[PDB]
Amino acid sequence: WEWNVTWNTSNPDFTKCFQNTVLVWVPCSYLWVCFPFYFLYLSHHDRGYIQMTHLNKAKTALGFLLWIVCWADLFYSFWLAPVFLVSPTLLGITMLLATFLIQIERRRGVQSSGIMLTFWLIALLCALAILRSKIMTAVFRDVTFYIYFSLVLIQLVLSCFSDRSPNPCPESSASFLSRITFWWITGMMVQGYRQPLESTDLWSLNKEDTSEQVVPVLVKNWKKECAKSDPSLFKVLYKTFGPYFLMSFLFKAVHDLMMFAGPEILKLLINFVNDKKAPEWQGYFYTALLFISACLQTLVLHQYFHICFVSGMRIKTAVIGAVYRKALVITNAARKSSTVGEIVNLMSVDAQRFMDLATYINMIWSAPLQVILALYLLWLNLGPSVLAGVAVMVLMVPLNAVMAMKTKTYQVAHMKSKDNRIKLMNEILNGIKVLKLYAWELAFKDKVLAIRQEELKVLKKSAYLAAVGTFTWVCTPFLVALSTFAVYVTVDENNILDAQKAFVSLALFNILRFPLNILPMVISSIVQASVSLKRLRVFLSHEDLDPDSIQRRPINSITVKNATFTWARNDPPTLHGITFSVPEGSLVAVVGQVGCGKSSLLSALLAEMDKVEGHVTVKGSVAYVPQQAWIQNISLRENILFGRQLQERYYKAVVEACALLPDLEILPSGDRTEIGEKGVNLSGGQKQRVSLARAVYCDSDVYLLDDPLSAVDAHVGKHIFENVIGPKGLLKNKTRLLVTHAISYLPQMDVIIVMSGGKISEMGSYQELLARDGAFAEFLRTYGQVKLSVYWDYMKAIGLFISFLSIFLFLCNHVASLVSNYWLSLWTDDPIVNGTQEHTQVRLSVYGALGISQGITVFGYSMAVSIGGIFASRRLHLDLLHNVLRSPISFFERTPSGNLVNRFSKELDTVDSMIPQVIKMFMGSLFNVIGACIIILLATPMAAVIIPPLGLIYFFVQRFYVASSRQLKRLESVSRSPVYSHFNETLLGVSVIRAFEEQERFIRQSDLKVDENQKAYYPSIVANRWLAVRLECVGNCIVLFASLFAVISRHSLSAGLVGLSVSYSLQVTTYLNWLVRMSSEMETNIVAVERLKEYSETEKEAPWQIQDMAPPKDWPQVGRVEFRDYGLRYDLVLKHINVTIDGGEKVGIVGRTGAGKSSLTLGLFRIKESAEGEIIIDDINIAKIGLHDLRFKITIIPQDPVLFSGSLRMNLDPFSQYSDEEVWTSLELAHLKGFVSALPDKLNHECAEGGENLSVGQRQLVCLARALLRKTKILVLDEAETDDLIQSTIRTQFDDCTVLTIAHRLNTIMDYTRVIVLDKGEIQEWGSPSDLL
Ligand SMILES: COc1ccc(CCN(C)CCC[C@@](C#N)(c2ccc(OC)c(OC)c2)C(C)C)cc1OC
Ligand SMILES: N[C@@H](CCC(=O)N[C@@H](CS)C(=O)NCC(=O)O)C(=O)O
């Protein structure tokens, strides 16, 4: 080895000894160090054995022949040089290890082989080097090498094909090349462009990713760790997911080391360029090396991502699964400790935090390592001056720190300021009819605007924080570079800033940019994950229930002796010393007062109570009808079935026996209707009916009916007891325990267990208990792509001047950056007078001025983008609110309130917060790519020949990502929420799930939900890997071509130009894929603006204020109403209505269900436009008057008064127009003075959502107080305990005003003269009640 023939000549030939020693030791050596390690994977991971195929044999036979050929050399050598003995034998032995390895890989089920691929690639390269040397030298031993090389090449080609297997995910059967390049998703991508992606096209999860495989291992590990007893969830997580984290650590270390090869090869290239008389091949070598290294880096890095992402995926699944399982075992006290919302948060935000932390968790050690290595390299280049740059990095430690903290604070406040608003919006939509009737649209618009501006103040304050953060991501490279260069050129004048010591350092600064700024974000995520992990450990350490506590003996039916139960370990017993024996097929009624311990008995028989002592021996399956009915959001049929085979005869015998036939009839789809909170709401009695029907269908032997007939009416209850619970019903032979407080069915009960204060008190049969005359007698005596129009709409909303100013400013940003780097290039070309440069001070001052301009410009650009973001959020929210409030009630009843809450919450969150960040990051990446291309073209114009093809590839890749990822990011969004919804419903009915022993069914359903979510999410991140590989293969191609065209034109190119072009090419690699990632996020985000602007063109109400034909101040002079041929369209509910209600004449409206009674009120307030009618009050037409005017001059007391959150005064007078004396007088006149004076807050009593704290009677009287305070001559009443009071009050002082009354009760209407009867919209009778009879 000497430089004359290897380095300093125009023919870069390796020496003969080097060829025969190191080039052969490299590949053989690779297999020798990997072989042992590879048994670990081959053994721990198995998939069966592959069959006997031609490919596998072809590879094995060539391995045998290759070994022979290599040993044939030893034979000829045996037939002087020491290397002619050891090298052939070593090659033969490693070759014998290669063929044995494909053999064992066949045995262990490895279709492709990465180890048997990289090894052949390394051998091929070594053979290629020797080959070129041997063909340049020119029979005896050469022909053996040609045979060796041809066999190695054919072996390498064979090793690429994937063997036979021993919508499945293609990753399982993908080859090594397809796995590293992520080609197995490519087809999906093109599919995602050709046709829309549904959940049916998503591949089945890998077996190792399915919930039923990951959750168990975590469950067993956690049980083992908690059995060893303080529990540590971190150790459990480590023990479960260690291999993935270690693999990610290895890949991140490799990437860390390989990303700094770029600057070293750039330094070598700059030395090559500035030094002429150097062999040209050295140049083309360096570029090639750089490209190769870069390629390797990206591959490694993306593998490092995949594992991490996969790991996070698995972790999320495990956590969710574990939580679900823990939800089914925890005692009642433990669930009372943490609210249902907090457990759902454990499922959602903690798991999401873990999965999104796993992406950058490894930077907690990579970033310090990257920083230390980069500082070492800079110290090699610059010297001690690098310390100054370190100072800037140190100066970036606190700022980022406080920045992070401040952001969190703002975010938290933002969250709060949003939640209230959403709650208020939830009150506006649920109660919009009342607001329209009372014309309170403007008041609640003002309230929502106030809360929104409170949120916008926090958003504006966080705009500055985000601008500071953007600055620390754009000027961190220059902030370090300017300091280091200034110190370097100032401390000693002999320090020359050549291209090697400037642009290599600049590339190092660009590298240092990421780790420095991501370390604070990683720390913040680690703290936010520490709190979530503490919550997860708190939940998973909660006490477990003992099914053993209750003896569940398969088929004296229920046995309890001396059993005392508790609701908590330290709380006193609720059931003291209970004993009773319920025989098989007997009806037992629990009897007591409120708080006696009746429901506690049924809870204790289900192992829900904490048994401090006793013995319970419930025999056979138990069907529980809880007091609070638990309804699944599935259809009513599946609610009754409860995951059981449908039997048409048994189902149709159960449904009517519960008297569910009328309920089925009223419901739209029958029994297929979607009952539950999300679907159609059901009355309490109907919910009890569904619960009882589910229990009866379940066909258990023991039934625990905790007050099944509380909410059903007396006739319905008696019918139910006759056909279901009674001795002649459906459950005649079933052991039925019924908790009741109704005597009507007591004599039919076989055994009555009457108790008092949680103690058995003389149980017995009804007649015997009555004869005894004791406790029971006492008890009885008790009583496509988004269009550019939406982008332009956001541009208009963001502020046209703001948008164009931001574009111009950030153009100045990138122009300043490019000019600063070109100025540095000119500075590096400066001649050196003696040991000093010509003009260093001037160039340094210009560099600093350009950089300070760039810093203030990025500050201003981020500031302006965020300011425009808050501007657009304000305008879009205001327009959405105005459109929603001005829209008719028909729109509200048509569109589900879920979509309106979606608009007001998630679209607003996307528009106001993350759209501006997406815009900033996308613009930055796009112009970084543009500037890199501009610099490459300026340095090497010929490189334009690479612009089309690569660009074409980019375009193609972009398309195949943008069309596909969105579809995968939509299917994720629709699949994540069901997982928590299911959990929430499970959390609500844990007792029902336990009682019916259907825990495994719900566990499997949760597994399926999480599996669907992961089937949506895994392609989402694999698509990111695929796009990143594709585009960092283009940016690597950009690096190679810029480097190659700089080497080709090295004579006309200065070293500074080469360094500048190569550094910008290095950074465009990272910037290019993020450009497309951001573009996809922008496309997904602008659909939010589209959704916000949807109701802007829908049909709106008539104008609230006309102001051309406004009525006088006293519009209802006497209150003379005249329906002149009124016809309401919603074929005609109201038709042929010609009636006249005189001023101050009491008139009521009577009719059956389906008549136009209520619709008539909607005619008065113009809720629905008159299809044909001329309602005129006094001498003024209603249709001509603006809505607000008439809605203010007419008052309505609806069926259910809607009390809004806030003070009572804001309920009575939202506008605060009426004085306090008027409010007090109206409240006194509403029989409410005594109560309203009782609240400590006086008139400012904070009533909750819907007035839950207030009683129904009080809310009704508050609505009456509203009507009385309005002091209008026309009043409408909608009648359904306090009836005597409200009727008297409406008959007390409103005799002066004209009152219409729609009452379902004839008793009240009889008092009112001039009754109007509506049969089917027609006026059946028009006259006084005296003429009625
Ligand atoms: C590409 O230019 C920019 C990059 C980042 C920023 C700051 C935006 N901040 C929210 C920080 C983003 C941080 C981050 C993300 N997401 C990021 C995005 C894009 C990046 O450049 C390709 C990046 O590397 C510098 C980091 C990390 C966490 C992956 C502004 C930029 O320009 C205005
Ligand atoms: N050179 C950086 C690259 C890290 C990187 O790619 N950053 C962002 C994108 S520029 C990322 O992690 N991407 C996550 C994703 O795939 O969504 C390093 O030090 O790892």
Curated annotation (Swiss-Prot):
<feature type="glycosylation site" description="N-linked (GlcNAc...) asparagine">
    <location>
        <position position="834"/>
    </location>
</feature>
<feature type="transmembrane region" description="Helical; Name=17">
    <location>
        <begin position="1055"/>
        <end position="1075"/>
    </location>
</feature>
<dbReference type="InterPro" id="IPR003439">
    <property type="entry name" value="ABC_transporter-like_ATP-bd"/>
</dbReference>
<dbReference type="GO" id="GO:0034634">
    <property type="term" value="F:glutathione transmembrane transporter activity"/>
</dbReference>
<dbReference type="Pfam" id="PF24357">
    <property type="entry name" value="TMD0_ABC"/>
</dbReference>
<comment type="similarity">
    <text>Belongs to the ABC transporter superfamily. ABCC family. Conjugate transporter (TC 3.A.1.208) subfamily.</text>
</comment>
<dbReference type="GO" id="GO:0042910">
    <property type="term" value="F:xenobiotic transmembrane transporter activity"/>
</dbReference>
<feature type="transmembrane region" description="Helical; Name=1">
    <location>
        <begin position="19"/>
        <end position="39"/>
    </location>
</feature>
<feature type="transmembrane region" description="Helical; Name=12">
    <location>
        <begin position="796"/>
        <end position="816"/>
    </location>
</feature>
<feature type="transmembrane region" description="Helical; Name=13">
    <location>
        <begin position="854"/>
        <end position="874"/>
    </location>
</feature>
<feature type="binding site">
    <location>
        <begin position="592"/>
        <end position="599"/>
    </location>
    <ligand>
        <name>ATP 1</name>
    </ligand>
</feature>
<dbReference type="GO" id="GO:0050729">
    <property type="term" value="P:positive regulation of inflammatory response"/>
</dbReference>
<feature type="topological domain" description="Cytoplasmic">
    <location>
        <begin position="305"/>
        <end position="360"/>
    </location>
</feature>
<keyword id="KW-0445">Lipid transport</keyword>
<feature type="transmembrane region" description="Helical; Name=2">
    <location>
        <begin position="60"/>
        <end position="79"/>
    </location>
</feature>
<feature type="transmembrane region" description="Helical; Name=9">
    <location>
        <begin position="385"/>
        <end position="405"/>
    </location>
</feature>
<feature type="transmembrane region" description="Helical; Name=15">
    <location>
        <begin position="940"/>
        <end position="960"/>
    </location>
</feature>
<feature type="domain" description="ABC transporter 2">
    <location>
        <begin position="1121"/>
        <end position="1333"/>
    </location>
</feature>
<feature type="topological domain" description="Extracellular">
    <location>
        <begin position="382"/>
        <end position="384"/>
    </location>
</feature>
<feature type="topological domain" description="Extracellular">
    <location>
        <begin position="489"/>
        <end position="510"/>
    </location>
</feature>
<dbReference type="InterPro" id="IPR003593">
    <property type="entry name" value="AAA+_ATPase"/>
</dbReference>
<keyword id="KW-0325">Glycoprotein</keyword>
<dbReference type="GO" id="GO:0042908">
    <property type="term" value="P:xenobiotic transport"/>
</dbReference>
<keyword id="KW-1278">Translocase</keyword>
<keyword id="KW-0677">Repeat</keyword>
<dbReference type="InterPro" id="IPR050173">
    <property type="entry name" value="ABC_transporter_C-like"/>
</dbReference>
<feature type="topological domain" description="Cytoplasmic">
    <location>
        <begin position="100"/>
        <end position="111"/>
    </location>
</feature>
<dbReference type="GO" id="GO:0071716">
    <property type="term" value="P:leukotriene transport"/>
</dbReference>
<keyword id="KW-1133">Transmembrane helix</keyword>
<feature type="modified residue" description="N6-succinyllysine">
    <location>
        <position position="423"/>
    </location>
</feature>
<feature type="domain" description="ABC transmembrane type-1 2">
    <location>
        <begin position="803"/>
        <end position="1084"/>
    </location>
</feature>
<feature type="topological domain" description="Cytoplasmic">
    <location>
        <begin position="40"/>
        <end position="59"/>
    </location>
</feature>
<feature type="transmembrane region" description="Helical; Name=16">
    <location>
        <begin position="1032"/>
        <end position="1052"/>
    </location>
</feature>
<dbReference type="Pfam" id="PF00005">
    <property type="entry name" value="ABC_tran"/>
</dbReference>
<feature type="topological domain" description="Cytoplasmic">
    <location>
        <begin position="961"/>
        <end position="1031"/>
    </location>
</feature>
<dbReference type="InterPro" id="IPR005292">
    <property type="entry name" value="MRP"/>
</dbReference>
<keyword id="KW-0547">Nucleotide-binding</keyword>
<keyword id="KW-1003">Cell membrane</keyword>
<keyword id="KW-0812">Transmembrane</keyword>
<dbReference type="GO" id="GO:0009410">
    <property type="term" value="P:response to xenobiotic stimulus"/>
</dbReference>
<feature type="binding site">
    <location>
        <begin position="1151"/>
        <end position="1158"/>
    </location>
    <ligand>
        <name>ATP 2</name>
    </ligand>
</feature>
<protein>
    <recommendedName>
        <fullName>Multidrug resistance-associated protein 1</fullName>
        <ecNumber>7.6.2.2</ecNumber>
        <ecNumber>7.6.2.3</ecNumber>
    </recommendedName>
</protein>
